[PDB]
Design a protein around this ligand. Structure first.
Ligand code: A1B2D
Ligand code: ZN
Length: 139
């Protein structure tokens, strides 16, 4: 689990979205595994607007933060799951690291702020859904 809270927006993994997230839907993209819903309270997370390829992510399955080097956002093929059939997921960055399904939602941060959230894994690689291109989260 895990979400990004900025302004009157809440960003979650689309596969983990609640009934309330869907009832207050702002935008969703199945290909990115992202869903943004509206909130009453104001959020204070700062979104990075950069092209950093190094950062730190939170891994609940180990109760630890790990420094990582990650790839640039791209179309990477993701094996079938109970949430989606086999497809290419867009805007995805990979890093050598540990992850488990329950780690989805953990934030990846660089020195500029929030970069994205944990979204895929397997084969000793962790996938992060990038959020830096969503400039509308700040206005
Ligand atoms: C963080 N994490 C996620 C996973 C693992 N860690 C390890 C096992 C694979 C699993 C995974 O890659 N998927 C299951 C959840 C939905 C994902 C998606 N966005 O399409 C695909
Ligand atoms: Zn950065």
């Amino acid at each position: 689990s895990g979400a990004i809270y900025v302004g009157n927006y809440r960003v979650v993994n689309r596969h983990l979205a609640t009934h309330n997230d869907w009832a207050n839907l702002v935008w969703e993209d199945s290909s990115r595994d992202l869903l943004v819903s509206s909130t009453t309270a104001q959020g204070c997370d700062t979104i990075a607007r950069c092209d950093c390829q190094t950062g730190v992510y939170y891994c609940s399955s180990r109760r630890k933060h790990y420094p990582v080097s990650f790839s640039k956002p791209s179309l990477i093929f993701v094996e079938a799951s109970e949430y989606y059939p086999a497809r290419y997921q867009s805007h995805l960055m990979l890093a050598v690291g540990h992850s488990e399904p329950g780690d989805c939602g953990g934030i990846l941060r660089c020195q500029h702020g929030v970069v994205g959230i944990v979204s895929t894994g397997g084969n000793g690689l962790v996938g992060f859904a990038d959020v830096r291109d969503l400039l509308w989260l700040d206005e």
